[PDB]
Amino acid sequence: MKIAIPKERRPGEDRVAISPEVVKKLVGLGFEVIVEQGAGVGASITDDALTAAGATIASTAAQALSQADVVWKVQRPMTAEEGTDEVALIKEGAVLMCHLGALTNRPVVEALTKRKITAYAMELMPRISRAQSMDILSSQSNLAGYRAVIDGAYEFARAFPMMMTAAGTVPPARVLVFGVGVAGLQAIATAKRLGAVVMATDVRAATKEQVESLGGKFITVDDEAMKTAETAGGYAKEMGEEFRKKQAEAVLKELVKTDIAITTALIPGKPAPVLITEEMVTKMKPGSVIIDLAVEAGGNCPLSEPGKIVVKHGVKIVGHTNVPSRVAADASPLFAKNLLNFLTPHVDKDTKTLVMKLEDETVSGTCVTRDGAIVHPALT
Amino acid sequence: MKIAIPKERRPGEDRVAISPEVVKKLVGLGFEVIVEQGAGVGASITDDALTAAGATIASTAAQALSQADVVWKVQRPMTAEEGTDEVALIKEGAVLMCHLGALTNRPVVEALTKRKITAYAMELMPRISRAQSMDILSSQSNLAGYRAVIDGAYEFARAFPMMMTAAGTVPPARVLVFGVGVAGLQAIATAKRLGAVVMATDVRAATKEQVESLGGKFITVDDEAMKTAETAGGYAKEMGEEFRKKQAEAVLKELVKTDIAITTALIPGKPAPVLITEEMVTKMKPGSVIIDLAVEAGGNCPLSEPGKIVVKHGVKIVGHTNVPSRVAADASPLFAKNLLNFLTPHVDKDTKTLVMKLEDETVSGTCVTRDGAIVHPALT
Amino acid sequence: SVKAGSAEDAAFIMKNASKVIIVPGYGMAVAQAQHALREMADVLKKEGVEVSYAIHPVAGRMPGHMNVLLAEANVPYDEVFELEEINSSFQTADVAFVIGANDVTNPAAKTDPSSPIYGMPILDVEKAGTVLFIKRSMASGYAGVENELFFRNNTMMLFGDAKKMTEQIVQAMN
Numbered sequence: 057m058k059i060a061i062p063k064e065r066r067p068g069e070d071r072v073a074i075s076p077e078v079v080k081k082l083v084g085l086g087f088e089v090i091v092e093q094g095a096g097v098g099a100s101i102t103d104d105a106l107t108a109a110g111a112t113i114a115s116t117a118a119q120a121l122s123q124a125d126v127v128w129k130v131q132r133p134m135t136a137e138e139g140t141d142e143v144a145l146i147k148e149g150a151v152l153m154c155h156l157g158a159l160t161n162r163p164v165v166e167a168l169t170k171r172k173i174t175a176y177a178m179e180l181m182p183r184i185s186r187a188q189s190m191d192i193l194s195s196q197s198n199l200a201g202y203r204a205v206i207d208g209a210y211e212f213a214r215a216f217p218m219m220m221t222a223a224g225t226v227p228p229a230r231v232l233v234f235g236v237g238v239a240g241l242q243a244i245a246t247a248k249r250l251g252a253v254v255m256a257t258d259v260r261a262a263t264k265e266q267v268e269s270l271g272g273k274f275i276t277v278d279d280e281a282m283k284t285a286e287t288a289g290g291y292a293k294e295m296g297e298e299f300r301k302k303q304a305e306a307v308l309k310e311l312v313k314t315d316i317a318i319t320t321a322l323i324p325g326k327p328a329p330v331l332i333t334e335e336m337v338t339k340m341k342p343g344s345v346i347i348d349l350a351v352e353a354g355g356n357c358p359l360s361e362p363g364k365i366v367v368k369h370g371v372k373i374v375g376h377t378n379v380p381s382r383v384a385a386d387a388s389p390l391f392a393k394n395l396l397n398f399l400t401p402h403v404d405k406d407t408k409t410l411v412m413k414l415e416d417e418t419v420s421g422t423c424v425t426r427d428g429a430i431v432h433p434a435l436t
Numbered sequence: 437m438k439i440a441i442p443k444e445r446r447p448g449e450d451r452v453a454i455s456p457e458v459v460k461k462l463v464g465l466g467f468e469v470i471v472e473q474g475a476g477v478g479a480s481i482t483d484d485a486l487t488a489a490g491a492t493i494a495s496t497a498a499q500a501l502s503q504a505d506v507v508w509k510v511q512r513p514m515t516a517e518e519g520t521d522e523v524a525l526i527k528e529g530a531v532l533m534c535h536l537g538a539l540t541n542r543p544v545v546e547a548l549t550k551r552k553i554t555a556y557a558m559e560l561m562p563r564i565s566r567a568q569s570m571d572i573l574s575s576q577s578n579l580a581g582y583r584a585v586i587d588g589a590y591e592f593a594r595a596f597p598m599m600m601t602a603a604g605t606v607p608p609a610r611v612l613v614f615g616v617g618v619a620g621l622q623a624i625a626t627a628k629r630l631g632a633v634v635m636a637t638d639v640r641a642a643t644k645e646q647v648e649s650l651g652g653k654f655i656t657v658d659d660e661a662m663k664t665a666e667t668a669g670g671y672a673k674e675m676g677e678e679f680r681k682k683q684a685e686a687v688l689k690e691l692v693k694t695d696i697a698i699t700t701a702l703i704p705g706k707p708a709p710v711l712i713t714e715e716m717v718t719k720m721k722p723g724s725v726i727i728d729l730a731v732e733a734g735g736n737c738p739l740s741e742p743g744k745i746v747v748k749h750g751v752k753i754v755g756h757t758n759v760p761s762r763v764a765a766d767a768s769p770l771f772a773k774n775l776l777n778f779l780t781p782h783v784d785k786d787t788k789t790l791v792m793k794l795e796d797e798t799v800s801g802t803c804v805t806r807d808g809a810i811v812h813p814a815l816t
Numbered sequence: 817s818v819k820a821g822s823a824e825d826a827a828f829i830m831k832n833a834s835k836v837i838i839v840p841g842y843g844m845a846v847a848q849a850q851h852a853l854r855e856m857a858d859v860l861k862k863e864g865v866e867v868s869y870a871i872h873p874v875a876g877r878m879p880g881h882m883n884v885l886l887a888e889a890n891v892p893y894d895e896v897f898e899l900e901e902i903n904s905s906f907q908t909a910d911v912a913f914v915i916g917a918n919d920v921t922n923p924a925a926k927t928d929p930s931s932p933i934y935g936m937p938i939l940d941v942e943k944a945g946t947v948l949f950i951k952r953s954m955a956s957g958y959a960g961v962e963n964e965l966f967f968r969n970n971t972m973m974l975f976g977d978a979k980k981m982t983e984q985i986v987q988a989m990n
């Protein structure tokens with residue numbers, strides 16, 4: 057059974073869905089591992105490194121994907137309509153595993169049905185304990201949280217840590233993270249590493265203990281409503297307009313003092329909640345920075361634009377696209393392990409084939425298309 | 437008595453030699469503080485903040501510096517040999533205080549001499565405890581050393597700290613600091629606190645303990661030689677090929693494992709020492725980055741180019757000019773404080789006039805020309 | 817005539833004190849005594865003692881040497897103070913706990929014209945009740961000059977490594 061990892065052809069994508077460690081394990085499972093020439097260059101994984109692990113280097117993309125029974129990829133394959141027909145290169149009746157973007161990109165899903173490809177949308181991994189090692193959103197957003205601080209410090213024209221100097225005391229930068237998810241917790245940790253005073257806020261009640269254990273200080277808003285705000289899958293729900301007004305006023309007291317604002321808040325399925333308005337950024341100090349990690353899902357700030365740095369009211373609003381690709385060389389080996397952890401339980405020991413189990417909710421929650429028909433409860 | 441601060445005219449330079457706090461101090465000493473409009477815009481200092489502090493805003497550079505018994509500035513003034521003539525704007529018999537680069541730029545001294553301008557080259561400040569209130573090298577290098585790590589982390593495609601996640605573990609970034617002066621030491625501190633494994637090396641014997649005092653590992657090359665490496669003023673001597681060969685050999689083992697090489701080594705007057713050869717660049721792993729803070733004195737890695745990030749042998753060699761200007765909003769008031777602390781002891785509180793202590797080591801050691809004669813022994 | 821002292825001596829001094837101003841310098845960094853110093857600060861605070869840190873502008877071998885190392889040890893920022901904020905408090909301080917610092921406290925800056933460090937503002941540790949200097953020997957600091965504060969009856973020398981000596985003091989306390 058052949059497995060193939062191509063190079064990511066989309067603009068700005070430097071990650072790859074393989075690493076030398078993961079190659080060895082696949083070979084151990086009985087796979088024949090093919091990788092496209094120069095695929096890991098952006099993630100600093102050479103061709104020589106992959107061959108040493110025990111893989112074949114195909115020269116072109118087409119040759120890599122021609123005979124491949126299973127295809128591992130980072131982002132969704134491009135179509136003819138997008139000026140590069142990557143879907144055609146995948147073998148008929150094969151199995152795709154990637155960040156498919158299924159709920160926003162139907163044209164690729166229905167293009168994959170036409171070739172009867174059984175695609176597994178890794179972004180839809182169910183929120184269950186045992187699937188933590190298989191979850192690409194979680195592994196990648198963790199690195200994005202770290203990266204938000206580095207971009208913040210790179211755009212900010214003052215230092216982060218407190219330093220008593222003979223030219224004067226340099227004061228610590230005051231960071232405020234909005235949304236203490238996987239990304240938020242790493243942003244706190246990294247900001248606190250660089251010596252910043254760190255504030256944070258979130259709707260879920262359990263995060264207050266997590267902020268405090270990292271040396272952060274939590275901005276409480278309304279303990280009654282925050283108790284009911286967590287869903288079954290352990291994420292936020294719609295808080296309505298009346299909570300937002302109470303939240304904004306409590307936030308403003310610290311936001312006016314804040315130097316770096318890192319917004320990471322997401323509501324799965326729904327658009328991203330507006331946590332910093334245009335009237336709120338006018339009240340901030342000129343020279344401050346806003347990092348909007350939710351920019352591609354509507355933005356927690358409405359002034360943010362995808363792939364751009366908007367300067368307005370003296371404040372830089374940063375909104376880079378594909379933030380985990382900015383940490384490509386750590387993103388890739390963990391993304392590859394997410395795919396490996398997902399796939400390994402379904403491989404036969406002495407059959408040498410892949411048996412994706414319908415009873416297993418990791419498979420049913422992930423599966424968008426199977427053999428020429430859309431199967432997922434969302435979509436159809 | 438009138439003191440004047442212009443906007444910095446050189447490209448990239450966003451700093452300014454003034455702050456609101458230092459304006460009112462100068463006014464308290466009895467000066468009339470003049471400043472060019474928009475001089476502090478790059479350093480987050482509005483004209484209203486300078487006006488509120490007590491300064492006069494002037495429309496142009498010529499109008500601010502016409503009249504102007506003292507001139508405070510960051511970079512050296514543009515000579516006519518570089519086209520635009522800034523020294524022509526300065527009053528005859530006025531006092532100039534800035535980084536002149538006097539040892540490498542004799543023409544600007546000759547130009548300043550031709551208008552009888554008394555010029556104090558602030559980079560020739562003796563490096564002693566008591567002169568630290570008035571040391572522009574220390575305050576600016578410290579931020580430049582901090583910046584190198586932020587810029588290294590920005591250009592580098594992995595995260596600094598080790599991370600132990602559910603998807604797996606990624607190692608820390610490995611940093612090597614060449615030259616452990618003020619900048620080098622703050623680079624170690626900022627890299628170490630971000631979670632990186634930090635190596636370092638230097639010629640001066642005192643360094644080894646200094647590196648270890650920040651939890652870094654010193655790379656020794658020849659301790660019988662480092663004894664004589666330090667001059668009377670704390671600077672490094674020219675070292676010779678015998679040592680240089682042995683350094684490149686000794687540092688090679690760590691440099692092959694290094695992700696981020698931050699090079700800061702300088703010698704007063706002379707071009708910066710080659711610490712990373714072209715052959716050494718070829719042997720570093722792909723995805724590595726070099727930050728060359730010595731780029732403006734020819735570079736420690738001489739493949740570096742001023743104002744440019746160049747990729748050579750798969751290694752991203754960074755060579756930003758005016759690195760303290762990347763932290764312009766903290767850098768500027770520290771620079772203004774240094775110039776205040778230099779000047780304050782020479783001001784007459786009663787008569788409101790400037791009378792310099794000529795025998796003062798601070799003043800004699802830093803003075804380059806006075807009343808149309810080049811005084812400093814280095815330039816005779 | 818130096819009044820030398822042990823860890824048990826320094827334990828009694830600060831156990832029976834109301835206010836203590838910790839003065840860290842380059843020696844603390846070399847010894848890497850940050851976590852023991854902050855642990856000592858916790859046991860003082862545990863029994864109601866007012867603790868605060870006094871960071872001299874040139875303390876260490878780089879700007880903000882003490883600040884990064886103290887941040888590593890998780891001292892609260894609201895207990896850390898610049899020279900101008902805290903210098904007044906030495907009058908009301910029972911103890912100036914000088915850990916690996918020297919030139920930072922030297923009154924040759926103010927009293928001695930012929931000194932090389934003359935004119936630099938210093939931390940007025942002498943104005944405290946008892947001055948505790950932790951250092952390995954009678955060797956001078958960076959400036960290469962003697963400190964007259966070593967030779968007076970309100971001062972105790974605590975000869976040893978700054979990590980080991982602070983750990984020994986914490987064990988002498990309870």
Ligand SMILES: NC(=O)c1ccc[n+]([C@@H]2O[C@H](COP(=O)([O-])OP(=O)(O)OC[C@H]3O[C@@H](n4cnc5c(N)ncnc54)[C@H](OP(=O)(O)O)[C@@H]3O)[C@@H](O)[C@H]2O)c1
Pocket residue numbers: 564565566574618840841842843844846847873874875876877878879880881916917918919920921950951952953954955956957958959976977978979
């Ligand atoms: N901040 C900067 O930018 C910078 C840079 C360069 C120089 N400086 C200068 O350095 C000085 C800084 O003042 P400071 O008070 O911090 O340092 P200092 O005056 O040089 O004194 C450091 C003291 O620590 C002791 N020490 C060293 N290692 C020790 C150890 N492992 N355990 C216990 N004690 C140890 C030394 O005495 P023993 O040897 O007897 O133990 C020494 O007396 C100033 O003169 C300043 O101008 C500052």
Ligand SMILES: NC(=O)C1C=CCN([C@@H]2O[C@H](COP(=O)(O)OP(=O)(O)OC[C@H]3O[C@@H](n4cnc5c(N)ncnc54)[C@H](O)[C@@H]3O)[C@@H](O)[C@H]2O)C1
Pocket residue numbers: 182183184185187188191194197234235236237238239257258259260289290291292295320321322323324329331
């Ligand atoms: N399989 C598994 O077990 C998990 C996989 C991923 C995440 N898992 C857990 O879910 C939560 C949230 O993590 P995630 O990073 O997935 O959250 P999101 O990316 O959806 O959104 C980021 C945070 O943003 C918060 N949020 C969302 N909306 C708001 C508003 N309006 N104000 C303030 N904060 C808000 C929300 O509570 C989230 O914590 C955290 O405890 C994780 O350990 C668990």
Ligand SMILES: NC(=O)C1C=CCN([C@@H]2O[C@H](COP(=O)(O)OP(=O)(O)OC[C@H]3O[C@@H](n4cnc5c(N)ncnc54)[C@H](O)[C@@H]3O)[C@@H](O)[C@H]2O)C1
Pocket residue numbers: 563564565566568573574577614615616617618619620637638639640669670671672675700701702703704709711874
């Ligand atoms: N008294 C005080 O408070 C001081 C405050 C700041 C600095 N002080 C002293 O000034 C001097 C000069 O410091 P600076 O940071 O200006 O050094 P440079 O910028 O000239 O150069 C950076 C380093 O580069 C090193 N260097 C220089 N050449 C080399 C070579 N060839 N290999 C390796 N390293 C080299 C050199 O030893 C320096 O440590 C040093 O002894 C400091 O302890 C003292």
